[PDB]
Swiss-Prot record:
This is Exoglucanase 2. It comes from the Eukaryota. Glycans are attached at residues 3, 13, 22, 25-26, 31, 38, 205, 226. The lineage of its organism: Eukaryota, Fungi, Dikarya, Ascomycota, Pezizomycotina. Exocellobiohydrolases (CBH) that catalyzes the hydrolysis of 1,4-beta-D-glucosidic bonds in cellulose to release the disaccharide cellobiose. The degradation of cellulose involves an interplay between different cellulolytic enzymes. Hydrolysis starts with endoglucanases (EGs), which cut internal beta-1,4-glucosidic bonds in cellulose to reduce the polymerization degree of the substrate and create new chain ends for exocellobiohydrolases (CBHs). The CBHs release the disaccharide cellobiose from the non-reducing end of the cellulose polymer chain. The chain holds residues 109 to 471 of 471 of the full protein. T.reesei produces two different exocellobiohydrolases. They are unique in that they can hydrolyze crystalline cellulose in the absence of endoglucanases. It is an enzyme of class 3 (hydrolase). The gene is cbh2. Optimum pH is 4-6.
Length: 363
């Protein structure tokens, strides 16, 4: 059944979408040989989230859900996985993933229309359990980056928009996880409570939506889940992995009026620890990374609903071309793989790296 009474990953199987599978099979495999080619075909079967990064990407959500509806007839019990990611003045503390809407030019109204579009799809497919990550980077930027003019000015718009998202997508077949950055961002002891306050306030302000299950961490990042050996670049932070992060912030959510908040954590680029990061804040196309813990609801953890692959490995974080639009200097750092295409575009050398360094291995 589509509705759920607790962990929304229980009794379902996350669906591996055709979009990523097409990228692997048609963009990666023709360039590979032997063992690597075979291993790549296997990656295409690991479920990762589909990002709805533009409004005209919404038909792809429908096509995925149509596939799932079909597969659910043949005994199967599959769930759809999507990222809601189109805020006006998006990615306010970076330049690589700037979006189609701006606050100045009716961006809030356009965002509401975008949410309206997604809501209709979810109603159309009320028979399918649908797992959503809400707006990566946004709320975390509001906690830590009010010193960035673009974020400071986006505050009221972000909170209005996110309130609209979590209220309009509050439906019985839906589970939403608000993006909550990662251990090396919001996990810092001094940021934990302010972050928890903001998250609980979003939840409370939205009348405690039943579909709002908790938080998503490590999205498009690389931190370890439960590594017992803290990496050099984590120096100074007692919260050096994602398990420590969720177990630190969880009780603070409860303290601020959000009880029963649960978590999902991205491990799609977390297989190699330590990573090739020379600094913890180096987020763009990081070298020395591999595909990580496979998506699974068997987490052996009180707070983690599921390990997930949110950022699809192989899809670029940003262009390394200083002369191109949306160039962010982070993408030209020593530990950023180069040359890199536009954010979201296929990045073959990066896919090859992730496959080579995969743990668990595909090879
Ligand atoms: C003490 C210390 C040392 C160091 O080398 O790096 C950091 C980095 C820190 O936080 C970083 O904050 C950034 C926001 O200004 C985050 O960037 C975002 O990263 C996501 C991916 O996780 C990406 O999608 C966004 O576009 C990007 O803006 C970055 O992840 C954090 O590491 C802190 Cl708090 C201390 C550091
Ligand atoms: C509360 O919801 C309203 C809806 O209009 C929104 O404008 C506001 O930003 C929200 N406040 C917080 C603190 O999330
Ligand atoms: C870390 O988590 C993984 C996946 O659940 C598990 O295989 C491993 O035993 C865990 N390690 C520790 C030290 O808890
Ligand atoms: C999900 O929730 C609905 C609404 O209560 C139930 O009818 C269904 O059986 C499932 O548990
Ligand atoms: C309602 O659904 C939850 C999972 O979402 C189960 O854990 C529970 O037993 C009940 O069936
Ligand atoms: C999702 O589908 C898998 C089979 O692919 C099952 O193992 C699971 O029970 C769920 O229906
Ligand atoms: C399958 O889909 C991918 C992503 O849209 C394309 O790159 C590929 O050419 C095929 O259409
Ligand atoms: C793309 O297509 C190939 C077969 O053409 C698969 O092996 C792969 O897993 C992906 O679906
Ligand atoms: C990737 O896309 C090509 C078409 O460009 C297909 O032929 C292939 O099966 C895969 O889906
Ligand atoms: C696959 O990757 C190779 C590099 O090994 C390219 O030459 C080719 O164009 C395709 O992108
Ligand atoms: C990867 O390895 C398998 C093993 O036989 C082959 O079927 C495939 O063609 C590729 O070499």
């Amino acid at each position: 059944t589509a509705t759920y009474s607790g962990n929304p990953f229980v009794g379902v199987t996350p669906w591996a979408n055709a979009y990523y599978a097409s990228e692997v099979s048609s963009l990666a495999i023709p360039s590979l040989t032997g063992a690597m080619a075979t291993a790549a075909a296997a990656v295409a079967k690991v479920p990762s989230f589909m990002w709805l990064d533009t409004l005209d990407k919404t038909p792809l959500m429908e096509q995925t859900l149509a596939d799932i509806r079909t597969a659910n007839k043949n005994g199967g019990n599959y769930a759809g996985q999507f990222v809601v990611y189109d805020l006006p003045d998006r990615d306010c503390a970076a330049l690589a993933s700037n979006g189609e809407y701006s606050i100045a030019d009716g961006g809030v109204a356009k965002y509401k229309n975008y949410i309206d579009t997604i809501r209709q799809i979810v109603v159309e497919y009320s028979d399918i359990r649908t797992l959503l990550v809400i707006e990566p980077a946004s709320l975390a930027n509001l906690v830590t980056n009010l010193g960035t003019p673009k974020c400071a000015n986006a505050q009221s718009a972000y909170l209005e928009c996110i309130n609209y998202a979590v209220t309009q997508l509050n439906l019985p077949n839906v589970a939403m996880y608000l993006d909550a950055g990662h251990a090396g961002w919001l996990g810092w002891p001094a940021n934990q409570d302010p972050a928890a306050q903001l998250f609980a306030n979003v939840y409370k302000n939205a009348s405690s939506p039943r579909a709002l299950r908790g938080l998503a961490t490590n999205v498009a990042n690389y931190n370890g889940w439960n590594i017992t050996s803290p990496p050099s670049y984590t120096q100074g932070n007692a919260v050096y992995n994602e398990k420590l992060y969720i177990h630190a912030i969880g009780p603070l959510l409860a303290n601020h009026g959000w009880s029963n908040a649960f978590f999902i954590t991205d491990q799609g680029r977390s297989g190699k620890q330590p990573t090739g990061q020379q600094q913890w804040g180096d987020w763009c196309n990081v070298i020395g990374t591999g595909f990580g813990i496979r998506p699974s609801a068997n987490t052996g953890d009180s707070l983690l609903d599921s390990f997930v692959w949110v950022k699809p490995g192989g899809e670029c974080d940003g262009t390394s071309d200083s002369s191109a639009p949306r160039f962010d200097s982070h993408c030209a750092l020593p530990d950023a793989l180069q040359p890199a295409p536009q954010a979201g575009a296929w990045f073959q050398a990066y896919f090859v790296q992730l496959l080579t360094n995969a743990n668990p291995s595909f090879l």
